[PDB]
Amino acid sequence: RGSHMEDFVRQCFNPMIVELAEKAMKEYGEDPKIETNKFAAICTHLEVCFMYSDGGSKHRFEIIEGRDRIMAWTVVNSICNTTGVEKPKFLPDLYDYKENRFIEIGVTRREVHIYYLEKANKIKSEKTHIHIFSFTGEEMATKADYTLDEESRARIKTRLFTIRQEMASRSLWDSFRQS
DNA sequence: TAGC
Ligand SMILES: [Mg+2]
Ligand SMILES: [Mg+2]
Secondary structure, eight states: OOOHHHHHHHHHSOHHHHHHHHHHHHHTTOOTTTOHHHHHHHHHHHHHHHHHHHTSOTTSEEEOTTSOHHHHHHHHHHHHHHHOOOOOSSOOSEEETTTTEEEEEEEESSOHHHHHHHHHHSOOOTTSEEEEEETTSOEEEGGGOOOSOHHHHHHHHHHHHHHHHHHHHTTOHHHHHTO
16 A cells, blocks of 8 residues: 655655665565655664764764664674774664764654653663754754764754655654654 | 654
8 A cells, every 4th residue: 555655755865765774674574665654764864874974074984874784783893893892782873983982873753852861771882972863953962972063963954854844745744753 | 763
Protein backbone atom coordinates (compact mmCIF):
# COMPACT_ATOMS: atom_id res chain seq x y z
CA ARG A 1 0.00 0.00 0.00
CA GLY A 2 1.55 3.29 -1.17
CA SER A 3 1.80 6.17 1.31
CA HIS A 4 2.30 9.89 0.81
CA MET A 5 5.15 9.89 3.34
CA GLU A 6 7.11 7.30 1.39
CA ASP A 7 6.85 9.28 -1.86
CA PHE A 8 7.72 12.49 0.03
CA VAL A 9 10.91 10.94 1.45
CA ARG A 10 12.02 9.72 -1.97
CA GLN A 11 11.76 13.16 -3.57
CA CYS A 12 13.11 15.11 -0.57
CA PHE A 13 16.38 13.25 0.13
CA ASN A 14 19.08 12.44 -2.35
CA PRO A 15 19.19 8.87 -3.76
CA MET A 16 22.37 7.92 -1.90
CA ILE A 17 20.75 8.76 1.45
CA VAL A 18 17.54 6.94 0.52
CA GLU A 19 19.48 3.85 -0.53
CA LEU A 20 21.45 3.84 2.74
CA ALA A 21 18.26 4.33 4.76
CA GLU A 22 16.58 1.37 3.02
CA LYS A 23 19.63 -0.82 3.57
CA ALA A 24 19.63 0.05 7.28
CA MET A 25 15.93 -0.76 7.69
CA LYS A 26 16.18 -4.08 5.86
CA GLU A 27 19.25 -5.10 7.90
CA TYR A 28 16.97 -4.99 10.97
CA GLY A 29 14.02 -6.59 9.15
CA GLU A 30 12.02 -3.40 8.58
CA ASP A 31 10.03 -2.18 5.57
CA PRO A 32 10.34 1.45 4.40
CA LYS A 33 6.90 1.13 2.79
CA ILE A 34 5.28 0.21 6.11
CA GLU A 35 7.26 2.14 8.73
CA THR A 36 7.32 5.35 6.75
CA ASN A 37 7.94 7.66 9.72
CA LYS A 38 11.02 5.63 10.70
CA PHE A 39 12.13 5.82 7.05
CA ALA A 40 11.89 9.61 7.22
CA ALA A 41 13.72 9.81 10.56
CA ILE A 42 16.55 7.59 9.29
CA CYS A 43 17.05 9.67 6.14
CA THR A 44 17.04 12.83 8.26
CA HIS A 45 19.59 11.41 10.70
CA LEU A 46 21.81 10.30 7.82
CA GLU A 47 21.73 13.71 6.15
CA VAL A 48 22.54 15.51 9.40
CA CYS A 49 25.46 13.18 10.16
CA PHE A 50 26.91 13.74 6.67
CA MET A 51 26.37 17.51 6.86
CA TYR A 52 28.04 17.50 10.26
CA SER A 53 31.06 15.61 8.98
CA ASP A 54 31.41 18.17 6.16
CA GLY A 55 31.76 20.96 8.73
CA GLY A 56 35.23 19.92 9.87
CA SER A 57 38.69 20.42 8.47
CA LYS A 58 39.58 17.76 5.91
CA HIS A 59 40.71 14.83 8.10
CA ARG A 60 38.80 15.76 11.23
CA PHE A 61 36.11 13.05 11.34
CA GLU A 62 35.81 9.32 10.80
CA ILE A 63 32.30 8.66 9.51
CA ILE A 64 30.75 5.66 11.31
CA GLU A 65 27.07 6.20 10.44
CA GLY A 66 26.06 4.90 7.01
CA ARG A 67 28.45 1.94 7.06
CA ASP A 68 27.37 -1.67 7.19
CA ARG A 69 27.02 -2.73 10.83
CA ILE A 70 29.97 -5.14 10.82
CA MET A 71 32.29 -2.67 9.09
CA ALA A 72 31.14 0.10 11.40
CA TRP A 73 32.28 -1.89 14.45
CA THR A 74 35.56 -2.84 12.74
CA VAL A 75 36.36 0.84 12.29
CA VAL A 76 35.32 1.65 15.87
CA ASN A 77 37.66 -1.10 17.07
CA SER A 78 40.51 0.27 14.93
CA ILE A 79 39.97 3.71 16.50
CA CYS A 80 39.82 2.33 20.04
CA ASN A 81 42.86 0.11 19.56
CA THR A 82 44.94 2.88 18.02
CA THR A 83 43.83 5.75 20.31
CA GLY A 84 43.12 3.85 23.53
CA VAL A 85 39.69 5.49 23.83
CA GLU A 86 37.14 3.22 25.53
CA LYS A 87 35.04 1.10 23.17
CA PRO A 88 31.49 2.55 23.09
CA LYS A 89 28.61 0.28 24.03
CA PHE A 90 26.42 1.39 21.10
CA LEU A 91 27.56 2.37 17.60
CA PRO A 92 28.25 6.14 17.55
CA ASP A 93 27.95 8.31 14.44
CA LEU A 94 31.37 9.98 14.04
CA TYR A 95 34.80 9.98 15.59
CA ASP A 96 36.46 13.36 16.18
CA TYR A 97 40.22 13.02 15.61
CA LYS A 98 40.79 16.59 16.75
CA GLU A 99 39.02 16.28 20.12
CA ASN A 100 39.61 12.49 20.27
CA ARG A 101 36.06 11.47 21.12
CA PHE A 102 33.17 9.61 19.53
CA ILE A 103 30.07 11.69 18.71
CA GLU A 104 26.45 10.55 18.96
CA ILE A 105 24.20 12.80 16.89
CA GLY A 106 20.47 12.95 17.49
CA VAL A 107 17.55 14.71 15.83
CA THR A 108 14.37 15.21 17.89
CA ARG A 109 10.86 16.63 17.55
CA ARG A 110 10.60 17.19 21.36
CA GLU A 111 12.48 19.61 23.63
CA VAL A 112 16.18 18.91 23.06
CA HIS A 113 16.95 18.10 26.68
CA ILE A 114 14.41 15.27 26.81
CA TYR A 115 16.15 13.38 24.02
CA TYR A 116 19.57 14.48 25.32
CA LEU A 117 18.88 13.02 28.76
CA GLU A 118 17.44 9.82 27.28
CA LYS A 119 20.58 9.24 25.20
CA ALA A 120 22.78 10.51 28.03
CA ASN A 121 21.22 7.82 30.24
CA LYS A 122 21.54 5.01 27.72
CA ILE A 123 25.23 5.98 27.74
CA LYS A 124 27.33 3.82 30.01
CA SER A 125 29.95 5.24 27.62
CA GLU A 126 30.60 8.35 29.72
CA LYS A 127 33.17 9.71 27.23
CA THR A 128 31.01 9.73 24.07
CA HIS A 129 30.01 13.27 23.08
CA ILE A 130 26.29 13.88 22.47
CA HIS A 131 25.03 16.57 20.08
CA ILE A 132 21.24 16.91 19.67
CA PHE A 133 19.43 19.04 17.07
CA SER A 134 15.70 19.81 17.03
CA PHE A 135 13.30 20.79 14.23
CA THR A 136 12.90 24.21 15.86
CA GLY A 137 16.49 25.38 15.55
CA GLU A 138 17.67 24.42 19.04
CA GLU A 139 20.71 22.31 19.85
CA MET A 140 22.22 20.80 22.97
CA ALA A 141 25.67 19.28 23.34
CA THR A 142 27.81 17.68 26.02
CA LYS A 143 29.62 20.25 28.20
CA ALA A 144 28.18 23.00 25.96
CA ASP A 145 30.94 22.14 23.49
CA TYR A 146 29.30 22.27 20.07
CA THR A 147 32.36 20.91 18.15
CA LEU A 148 31.76 22.81 14.88
CA ASP A 149 31.80 26.50 14.07
CA GLU A 150 28.47 28.29 14.22
CA GLU A 151 27.93 28.48 10.43
CA SER A 152 28.16 24.69 10.04
CA ARG A 153 25.56 24.08 12.74
CA ALA A 154 23.31 26.87 11.39
CA ARG A 155 23.20 25.11 7.99
CA ILE A 156 21.93 21.98 9.70
CA LYS A 157 19.24 23.84 11.64
CA THR A 158 18.07 25.53 8.46
CA ARG A 159 17.79 22.23 6.58
CA LEU A 160 15.85 20.60 9.42
CA PHE A 161 13.36 23.46 9.54
CA THR A 162 12.99 23.16 5.77
CA ILE A 163 12.15 19.44 6.12
CA ARG A 164 9.58 20.35 8.77
CA GLN A 165 7.89 22.91 6.50
CA GLU A 166 7.83 20.53 3.54
CA MET A 167 6.08 17.91 5.67
CA ALA A 168 3.66 20.45 7.16
CA SER A 169 2.85 21.66 3.64
CA ARG A 170 1.83 18.06 2.83
CA SER A 171 -0.09 17.52 6.13
CA LEU A 172 2.53 14.93 7.08
CA TRP A 173 4.09 16.82 9.98
CA ASP A 174 1.49 15.99 12.64
CA SER A 175 1.78 12.22 12.17
CA PHE A 176 5.58 12.54 11.93
CA ARG A 177 5.88 14.67 15.09
CA GLN A 178 3.43 12.38 16.92
CA SER A 179 5.25 9.18 15.86
C1' DT B 1 15.83 6.34 14.59
C1' DA B 2 13.67 8.19 18.26
C1' DG B 3 8.95 8.71 20.57
C1' DC B 4 6.50 6.33 23.94
MG1 LIG C 1 23.67 6.70 15.16
MG1 LIG D 1 22.82 9.15 16.40
